[PDB]
Structure formats: structure tokens, C-alpha cells
Amino acid sequence: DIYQTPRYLVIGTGKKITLECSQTMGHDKMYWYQQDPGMELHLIHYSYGVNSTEKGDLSSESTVSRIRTEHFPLTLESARPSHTSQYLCASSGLRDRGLYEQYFGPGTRLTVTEDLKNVFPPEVAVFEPSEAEISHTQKATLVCLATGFYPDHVELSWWVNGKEVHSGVCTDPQPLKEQPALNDSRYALSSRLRVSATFWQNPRNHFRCQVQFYGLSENDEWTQDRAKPVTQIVSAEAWGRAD
Amino acid sequence: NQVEQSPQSLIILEGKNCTLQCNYTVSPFSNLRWYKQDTGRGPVSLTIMTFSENTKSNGRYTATLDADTKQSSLHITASQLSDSASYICVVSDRGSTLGRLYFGRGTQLTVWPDIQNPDPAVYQLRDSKSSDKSVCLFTDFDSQTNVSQSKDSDVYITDKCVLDMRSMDFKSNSAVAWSNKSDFACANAFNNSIIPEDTFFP
């Protein structure tokens, strides 16, 4: 398969960044694409094989190395806010019928911030269903708000009685900027879990909104008095209400 | 650009089929592919065709190629919410190593829920009191309703979101508004939106 590390990175302006891409398919052709949310893919680098390295369609400050077939690491010698986006590695090999089939890696989401003191975890709050909704519709919507987070590197899930659930859930596709006129604005995200009124009204039912936040690593420096915004799960919970 | 796609975007209801079009000027022509890209995710190859084939199928996706007219179509049978995605047409000029991939800009497909019984209502979600925030929920409106941003920078409003209760076999739209100020009440939250006159305000 095709592999990329790290899944998420936040780093200060000016620092060196290496993004790893590896695969054990024996593939000679390999690719680096760049993509901002909602935009089109731009080929940034490619490689024909074991010792090949060519500039893609979009010019970049990044360079690449293909010293070995298995590895195609992308390097950014001094990060700038402008390098903020998603970086997708791909490979393709000879399949059948005379075809090269392109396989994409999981990607790395990169944010370059001015200062690591801009990095904040989410605060998470669960809001319990309205009694007016229950009596009107026989359904019960819980809302979860994750607020005040930077970077926008967050995974929100709902858990009911200890199992992650996807049915009855909608999470905003994109987070809100708290301050749209600012570059390192913090973010908010909303999610909804809808269940039946009888399910909510069972006090044995436990409902939990969980936000995985990807932040600083144990290698990052931190001189602030506030808690170091490391990678962490922030959660909030509610139990059923018998009315 | 040697690869062009149509439409730019479209909205269809679940259950309906659609057709996406791709046209290219790439010469020489070796092969043609369709990719599905979900938001935040890498593209997933659907069907790969050479000129020696006029048809390829991948479950509900069926791709056609007329290499003479340099046109391909992707047909989706019985569209589902999960079909909402970017669809990318890519063309390769040569079969060998030294060939190049040419990407179209993509087609954005949005699939809407079929809402038979809209019951638009704005509800107040009991104050967390663990949180200083008050939350209002606009729910059960038809996909025709557009939710607007607030006219207040201390009031946050999210766009409409489709939720699928895959058991009651029920789908519903909702939008969320919150603010921490004393001003904020659910009666005003969505005032900047054109909401249906029959909207329930408990």
C-alpha cells in the first residue's frame, strides 16, 4: 500500500519540513500533488523511477528526493504560511490490459503558522435536545460545538454507549473562522446527532461528542504559561433524560 | 487545458441517475480514467479505459469512451448521498513510462435528500450551563431553503447539513446558530434567512 507521515502537521514560519511518502508496491512512477480545500489538484513534483525528480505543473519552493524506489520525501526548507494546504503523494505501476493505475496516499494536512502560541485546542460542549422538538417530532437532536481551535486539524466523532455512530450524524464539512479578517483565526465546528425521542428518554443511554485535535508534538518548544496545546482528545458527554 | 469537463457542478435528488461529460484534445491518446474525490480525501480511481474498450463498469458507475470524438461519459445509477463528491476525468497520452497524466478540473456533484414531509422549526437546545453558549437549531426544512450568515460577528451560523437516520429511513436538514451574548434568542437567530412562512417557533 501507499503511506504518508505525518497525517497532520502544524509548524512555525521559517522551519524545515519533511513530508514522508513510501510504498511497497514496487512502483517506479510517483507523484506529489498540492490541493487547498475546494480547489483543484496541482501536480507539484513527479518521478519516473529510482533516481528521477521532475517539477510538476505548479512551481513550488519544495524539492523532492528519489534516492530509493520505496521513498519519495518532500522537503520544504523554510516553511511559510503560503505552504498551508494538503499534500497528496501518489504512485502508479503496470497493472493489466496495458494500464498504469494511480494510487493516492492518505495525505498530509499542513498548516504553517506565524507563531506556535497561535495553537489552541478545541473546547467542546454538548447541547441536549429541546423538549419542544421531542414533543413536536418524536425525535431528539443533540448538538456538539468545538470552539476556539487552531489549527483546523480536528476530527469530530459521536459515540453512543461506547460505539462510534455515523447514522443520524451531520458534521459541518468545513469549520467557521471566529475572525474571518485574520490569517491565524481560531475555528469553530458544529455537529448534530439525531435519535428517536424514546432513545433519548432512556437515562441508561450515554451520548459523547469527541474531538481529536492534532497539535504540537513532544518535540515542539513551549514557553507559555497556558497548557501546551499537544495532540489530544477533548470530549463532552450527556446521558438520557426521562422527562 | 487539454481536458475539459461538464457540467461545472450539478444538484440531483437521491435515486436519480446522472451523466457527467469529459472532452479532451490530448494527442496521442492512450487511456482515460474517472476519479471520485471526497472532500478532504485523495482521489479514488473508478474506471480506466483504453481506446480498445468503449465501456467500463465499477458497481453503479459506468464509463463510456468514444475515442474517435475524444469524448467520455460517466453515468451514475441510482444516486445516493454518498455520491456527493468531485468527479475527475484524467487522460494519459502514452502507455509507456514517459507518458503524462492530464487532469480535468472536475465536476462537483451534490446529491440532495428527497424530503417528503418538511416540518421547518427553530428550537432552542437547553443551555449547557457547563458552557456560556446558547444554541438554536433550524431543522426539517426542504433543501430549497438557503441558510444565511448572521449580521452579527458574535453570532455564528453554520450552513445546512444533511443527516441520515438510516433506520427510521429519515433524512433532515439542519443549521446551527450560537452566540454567548445576552441579546441572542432563537426568535431572531435566523432573521437574516428566508425561512418558510410555516416555520414552527415553539
SS3 B105: coil
Residue range(s) occupied by CATH 2.60.40.10 in chain A = 1-114, 115-240
**Over the Cα atoms of chain A, what is R_g?**
22
Q: Which of B110, B107, B120 is nearest to B173 (CA)?
A: B120
- Amino acid sitting at position A5: T
> Is B14:B112 a contact under the CB 8 Å cutoff?
yes
Query: Computed from CA positions of residues A24, A26, A27, A31, in that sequence, does the dihedral angle turn out positive or negative?
Result: positive
CATH number for the region A1-114 comes to 2.60.40.10
Task: Indicate which technique resolved this structure.
Answer: X-ray
d(CA A53, CA B130): 55
Q: How big is the CA angle at A123 (ends A117 and A124), to the nearest 5 degrees?
A: 155
Asked if B24 and B1 count as a contact pair (C-beta separation under 8 A), the reply is no
The per-residue b/e assignment along B134-144, b for 16 or more CB within 10 angstroms, e otherwise, is: bbbbbbbbebe
Chain B residues with CB under 8 Å of A99 CB are 31, 48, 50, 95
Q: Which of B99, B126, B174 sits opposite A170 (nearest CB)?
A: B174
Contacts of A163 (CB under 8 A, 6+ apart): none
Hey, are the CB atoms on B139 and A168 less than 8 Å from each other?
no
Other beta carbons within 10 Å of B11: 12
Those residues with Cβ within 8 angstroms of residue B129's Cβ, 6 or more apart along the chain or in another chain: none
The reply to whether residue B165 touches residue A194, judged by beta carbons under 8 angstroms, is yes
**Omega within 30 of 0 (cis) for the link into A6:** yes
Beta-carbon separation of A172 and B158 below 8 A: yes
Q: Which residues of B touch A208 (CB under 8 A)?
A: none
DSSP letter at A57? S
Rg (C-alpha) for chain B, rounded Å, is 22
Q: Do A169 and B163 touch (CB under 8 A)?
A: yes
Q: Region of A26 please: left (phi>0), alpha (psi -120 to 50) or beta.
A: left
B81 at the A interface (CB within 8 A)?
A: no
Domains and CATH numbers, chain B: 1-113 (2.60.40.10), 114-202 (2.60.40.10)
Question: With contact defined as beta carbons under 8 Å apart, do A197 and A140 qualify?
Answer: yes
Query: How many whole angstroms separate alpha carbon A93 and alpha carbon A27?
Result: 5
Q: CB neighbours (10 Å) of residue B43?
A: 26
- The CATH superfamily assigned to A115-240 is Immunoglobulins (2.60.40.10)
Instruction: Report which residue type is found at A222.
Output: W
B29, three cell numbers: 491518446
Q: Which residues of A touch B97 (CB under 8 A)?
A: 28-29, 48-49
Q: How far apart are CA B6 and CA A150, in angstroms?
A: 37
Which helix H or strand E contains A192, and what residues bound it? strand A187-196
The beta-carbon neighbor of A125 closest among B98, B133, B174 is B133
Record: contact B41-A107, CB cut-off 8 A: yes
Residue A12 region, left (φ>0) first, then alpha (ψ -120 to 50), else beta? beta
Q: Which of B39, B164, B178 is opposite residue A173, by nearest beta carbon?
A: B39
Q: Which grid cell is A119?
A: 495553537
The number of helices, as runs of H, and strands, as runs of E, in chain A is 2, 20
Question: DSSP for B1-39?
Answer: --EEEE-SEEEEETT--EEEEEEE--SS--EEEEEEE-T
Strand ranges inside B51-187, DSSP E: 55-58, 61-66, 71-76, 85-92, 101-103, 107-112, 121-125, 134-139, 155-157, 161-165, 170-179
Could you tell me the resolution of this structure in angstroms? 2.2
Q: Residue B195 belongs to what H/E stretch? A: none
